[PDB]
Amino acid sequence: TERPVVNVPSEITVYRGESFEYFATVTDNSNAFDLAKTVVRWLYSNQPGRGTEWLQYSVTQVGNQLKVRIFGNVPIDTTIGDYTRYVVATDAAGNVNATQTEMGNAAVDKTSVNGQFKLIIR
Ligand code: NA
Ligand code: NA
Ligand code: NA
Ligand code: NA
Ligand code: NA
Ligand code: NA
């Protein structure tokens, strides 16, 4: 009950040669966040990820929630396919919606964590 909660589109579809601009939301029972530790990343590191290096995000406080803008410009030559990515949010007290251990276990087991989504390039 102390962890923040992301709502993100389960499948974010982007197209070669086009930009995109999707939104996710974070809520927390404390109403307060660590915006510097709220990120969009691939599994392995706090980075956008190989094959999706153009994936960008921004974090804004709106009232008691976070607005997470997920955006970028997809190069015309980008490789098509499907990638798993993550919105990892931190409340002001340092609680997270998903830990790296939870993320790693889900990736191996083919299960999911809060904030996980599929990024599909067409
Ligand atoms: Na909390
Ligand atoms: Na949801
Ligand atoms: Na839902
Ligand atoms: Na554009
Ligand atoms: Na709240
Ligand atoms: Na961390």
PDB file of C-alpha atoms and ligand atoms in Angstrom:
ATOM      1  CA  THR A   1       0.000   0.000   0.000  1.00  0.00           C
ATOM      2  CA  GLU A   2       3.009   2.268   0.433  1.00  0.00           C
ATOM      3  CA  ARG A   3       4.263   1.731  -3.145  1.00  0.00           C
ATOM      4  CA  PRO A   4       3.482   4.133  -6.008  1.00  0.00           C
ATOM      5  CA  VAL A   5       1.326   2.839  -8.874  1.00  0.00           C
ATOM      6  CA  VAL A   6       1.916   3.428 -12.593  1.00  0.00           C
ATOM      7  CA  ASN A   7      -0.828   3.304 -15.208  1.00  0.00           C
ATOM      8  CA  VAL A   8       0.743   2.975 -18.663  1.00  0.00           C
ATOM      9  CA  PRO A   9      -0.617   1.874 -22.047  1.00  0.00           C
ATOM     10  CA  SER A  10       0.156  -1.844 -22.230  1.00  0.00           C
ATOM     11  CA  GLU A  11       1.324  -1.563 -25.857  1.00  0.00           C
ATOM     12  CA  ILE A  12       2.974   1.614 -27.183  1.00  0.00           C
ATOM     13  CA  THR A  13       3.129   1.471 -31.005  1.00  0.00           C
ATOM     14  CA  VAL A  14       5.500   3.738 -32.932  1.00  0.00           C
ATOM     15  CA  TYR A  15       6.255   4.013 -36.660  1.00  0.00           C
ATOM     16  CA  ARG A  16       9.485   4.497 -38.598  1.00  0.00           C
ATOM     17  CA  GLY A  17       9.955   8.080 -39.788  1.00  0.00           C
ATOM     18  CA  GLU A  18       7.311   9.380 -37.369  1.00  0.00           C
ATOM     19  CA  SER A  19       7.307  10.962 -33.945  1.00  0.00           C
ATOM     20  CA  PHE A  20       5.123   9.704 -31.071  1.00  0.00           C
ATOM     21  CA  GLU A  21       3.714  11.171 -27.850  1.00  0.00           C
ATOM     22  CA  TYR A  22       2.036   8.830 -25.322  1.00  0.00           C
ATOM     23  CA  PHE A  23       1.222   9.390 -21.622  1.00  0.00           C
ATOM     24  CA  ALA A  24       1.414   7.403 -18.387  1.00  0.00           C
ATOM     25  CA  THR A  25       0.279   8.412 -14.881  1.00  0.00           C
ATOM     26  CA  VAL A  26       1.705   7.753 -11.408  1.00  0.00           C
ATOM     27  CA  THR A  27      -0.336   7.866  -8.189  1.00  0.00           C
ATOM     28  CA  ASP A  28       0.831   7.445  -4.574  1.00  0.00           C
ATOM     29  CA  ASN A  29      -0.925   7.472  -1.169  1.00  0.00           C
ATOM     30  CA  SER A  30       1.675  10.141   0.014  1.00  0.00           C
ATOM     31  CA  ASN A  31       0.844  12.473  -2.937  1.00  0.00           C
ATOM     32  CA  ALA A  32       4.594  13.146  -3.174  1.00  0.00           C
ATOM     33  CA  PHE A  33       7.279  11.802  -5.505  1.00  0.00           C
ATOM     34  CA  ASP A  34      10.982  11.654  -6.264  1.00  0.00           C
ATOM     35  CA  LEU A  35      10.776  12.958  -9.834  1.00  0.00           C
ATOM     36  CA  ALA A  36      14.539  12.515 -10.392  1.00  0.00           C
ATOM     37  CA  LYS A  37      14.132   8.777  -9.664  1.00  0.00           C
ATOM     38  CA  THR A  38      11.061   8.304 -11.891  1.00  0.00           C
ATOM     39  CA  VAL A  39      12.248   6.972 -15.252  1.00  0.00           C
ATOM     40  CA  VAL A  40      11.417   5.090 -18.453  1.00  0.00           C
ATOM     41  CA  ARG A  41      14.071   2.430 -19.151  1.00  0.00           C
ATOM     42  CA  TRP A  42      14.890  -1.010 -20.495  1.00  0.00           C
ATOM     43  CA  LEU A  43      15.573  -3.889 -18.113  1.00  0.00           C
ATOM     44  CA  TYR A  44      19.350  -3.884 -17.814  1.00  0.00           C
ATOM     45  CA  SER A  45      20.306  -0.264 -17.069  1.00  0.00           C
ATOM     46  CA  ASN A  46      18.758   3.162 -16.459  1.00  0.00           C
ATOM     47  CA  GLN A  47      18.831   3.936 -20.179  1.00  0.00           C
ATOM     48  CA  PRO A  48      16.358   3.860 -23.099  1.00  0.00           C
ATOM     49  CA  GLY A  49      17.815   0.597 -24.413  1.00  0.00           C
ATOM     50  CA  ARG A  50      19.439  -0.954 -27.456  1.00  0.00           C
ATOM     51  CA  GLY A  51      17.137  -0.697 -30.470  1.00  0.00           C
ATOM     52  CA  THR A  52      15.185   2.143 -28.823  1.00  0.00           C
ATOM     53  CA  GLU A  53      17.908   4.718 -28.130  1.00  0.00           C
ATOM     54  CA  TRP A  54      15.523   7.485 -29.333  1.00  0.00           C
ATOM     55  CA  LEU A  55      12.986   6.735 -26.540  1.00  0.00           C
ATOM     56  CA  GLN A  56      12.545   9.863 -24.394  1.00  0.00           C
ATOM     57  CA  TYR A  57      10.446  10.804 -21.385  1.00  0.00           C
ATOM     58  CA  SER A  58       9.578  13.709 -19.115  1.00  0.00           C
ATOM     59  CA  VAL A  59       8.018  13.805 -15.640  1.00  0.00           C
ATOM     60  CA  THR A  60       5.610  16.528 -14.418  1.00  0.00           C
ATOM     61  CA  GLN A  61       3.708  16.881 -11.146  1.00  0.00           C
ATOM     62  CA  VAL A  62      -0.004  17.570 -11.727  1.00  0.00           C
ATOM     63  CA  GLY A  63      -1.777  17.948  -8.398  1.00  0.00           C
ATOM     64  CA  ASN A  64      -1.215  14.740  -6.409  1.00  0.00           C
ATOM     65  CA  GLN A  65      -0.071  12.667  -9.425  1.00  0.00           C
ATOM     66  CA  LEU A  66       2.728  12.453 -11.995  1.00  0.00           C
ATOM     67  CA  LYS A  67       2.203  12.943 -15.733  1.00  0.00           C
ATOM     68  CA  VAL A  68       4.847  10.916 -17.614  1.00  0.00           C
ATOM     69  CA  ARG A  69       5.211  11.905 -21.280  1.00  0.00           C
ATOM     70  CA  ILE A  70       6.750   9.105 -23.409  1.00  0.00           C
ATOM     71  CA  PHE A  71       7.910  10.540 -26.725  1.00  0.00           C
ATOM     72  CA  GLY A  72      10.504  10.633 -29.468  1.00  0.00           C
ATOM     73  CA  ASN A  73      11.359  10.622 -33.170  1.00  0.00           C
ATOM     74  CA  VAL A  74      11.765   7.150 -34.732  1.00  0.00           C
ATOM     75  CA  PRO A  75      14.452   7.054 -37.460  1.00  0.00           C
ATOM     76  CA  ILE A  76      13.273   5.746 -40.826  1.00  0.00           C
ATOM     77  CA  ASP A  77      15.940   2.972 -40.687  1.00  0.00           C
ATOM     78  CA  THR A  78      15.076   1.665 -37.193  1.00  0.00           C
ATOM     79  CA  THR A  79      14.761  -2.099 -36.876  1.00  0.00           C
ATOM     80  CA  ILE A  80      11.141  -3.210 -36.468  1.00  0.00           C
ATOM     81  CA  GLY A  81      10.014  -5.427 -33.636  1.00  0.00           C
ATOM     82  CA  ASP A  82       8.819  -5.639 -30.060  1.00  0.00           C
ATOM     83  CA  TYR A  83      10.647  -4.580 -26.907  1.00  0.00           C
ATOM     84  CA  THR A  84       9.812  -4.710 -23.206  1.00  0.00           C
ATOM     85  CA  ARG A  85      10.292  -1.386 -21.382  1.00  0.00           C
ATOM     86  CA  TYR A  86       9.449  -0.102 -17.906  1.00  0.00           C
ATOM     87  CA  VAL A  87       8.120   2.963 -16.128  1.00  0.00           C
ATOM     88  CA  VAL A  88       9.898   2.855 -12.748  1.00  0.00           C
ATOM     89  CA  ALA A  89       8.481   5.377 -10.282  1.00  0.00           C
ATOM     90  CA  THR A  90       9.719   6.442  -6.854  1.00  0.00           C
ATOM     91  CA  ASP A  91       7.680   8.176  -4.145  1.00  0.00           C
ATOM     92  CA  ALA A  92       9.179  10.885  -1.953  1.00  0.00           C
ATOM     93  CA  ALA A  93       9.944   8.288   0.763  1.00  0.00           C
ATOM     94  CA  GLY A  94      11.936   6.150  -1.702  1.00  0.00           C
ATOM     95  CA  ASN A  95       9.432   3.357  -2.295  1.00  0.00           C
ATOM     96  CA  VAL A  96       9.307   2.049  -5.876  1.00  0.00           C
ATOM     97  CA  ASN A  97       6.532   0.492  -7.946  1.00  0.00           C
ATOM     98  CA  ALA A  98       8.903  -2.289  -9.097  1.00  0.00           C
ATOM     99  CA  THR A  99      12.389  -3.293  -7.934  1.00  0.00           C
ATOM    100  CA  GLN A 100      15.140  -4.524 -10.245  1.00  0.00           C
ATOM    101  CA  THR A 101      14.855  -8.002  -8.689  1.00  0.00           C
ATOM    102  CA  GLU A 102      11.110  -8.063  -9.408  1.00  0.00           C
ATOM    103  CA  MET A 103      11.814  -6.921 -12.977  1.00  0.00           C
ATOM    104  CA  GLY A 104      14.477  -9.589 -13.541  1.00  0.00           C
ATOM    105  CA  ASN A 105      12.285 -12.388 -12.179  1.00  0.00           C
ATOM    106  CA  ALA A 106       9.399 -11.276 -14.369  1.00  0.00           C
ATOM    107  CA  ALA A 107      11.600 -11.152 -17.474  1.00  0.00           C
ATOM    108  CA  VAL A 108      12.865 -14.700 -16.977  1.00  0.00           C
ATOM    109  CA  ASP A 109       9.465 -16.121 -15.993  1.00  0.00           C
ATOM    110  CA  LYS A 110       7.602 -14.225 -18.749  1.00  0.00           C
ATOM    111  CA  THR A 111       5.397 -12.504 -16.107  1.00  0.00           C
ATOM    112  CA  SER A 112       4.879  -8.822 -15.476  1.00  0.00           C
ATOM    113  CA  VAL A 113       5.435  -5.965 -12.990  1.00  0.00           C
ATOM    114  CA  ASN A 114       3.592  -2.693 -12.534  1.00  0.00           C
ATOM    115  CA  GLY A 115       4.730  -0.173 -15.134  1.00  0.00           C
ATOM    116  CA  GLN A 116       5.929  -2.757 -17.668  1.00  0.00           C
ATOM    117  CA  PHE A 117       4.880  -2.182 -21.292  1.00  0.00           C
ATOM    118  CA  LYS A 118       5.611  -3.369 -24.819  1.00  0.00           C
ATOM    119  CA  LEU A 119       7.152  -0.888 -27.273  1.00  0.00           C
ATOM    120  CA  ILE A 120       6.329  -1.994 -30.831  1.00  0.00           C
ATOM    121  CA  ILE A 121       8.105  -0.506 -33.860  1.00  0.00           C
ATOM    122  CA  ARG A 122       6.281  -0.754 -37.211  1.00  0.00           C
TER     123      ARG A 122
HETATM  124 NA    NA B   1       3.925   5.708  -1.121  1.00  0.00          NA
HETATM  125 NA    NA B   2      -3.072  -0.032 -15.233  1.00  0.00          NA
HETATM  126 NA    NA B   3      -6.365  -0.854 -16.297  1.00  0.00          NA
HETATM  127 NA    NA B   4       6.625  15.256 -35.447  1.00  0.00          NA
HETATM  128 NA    NA B   5      -2.660   9.975  -3.695  1.00  0.00          NA
HETATM  129 NA    NA B   6      17.287   2.753  -8.489  1.00  0.00          NA
END
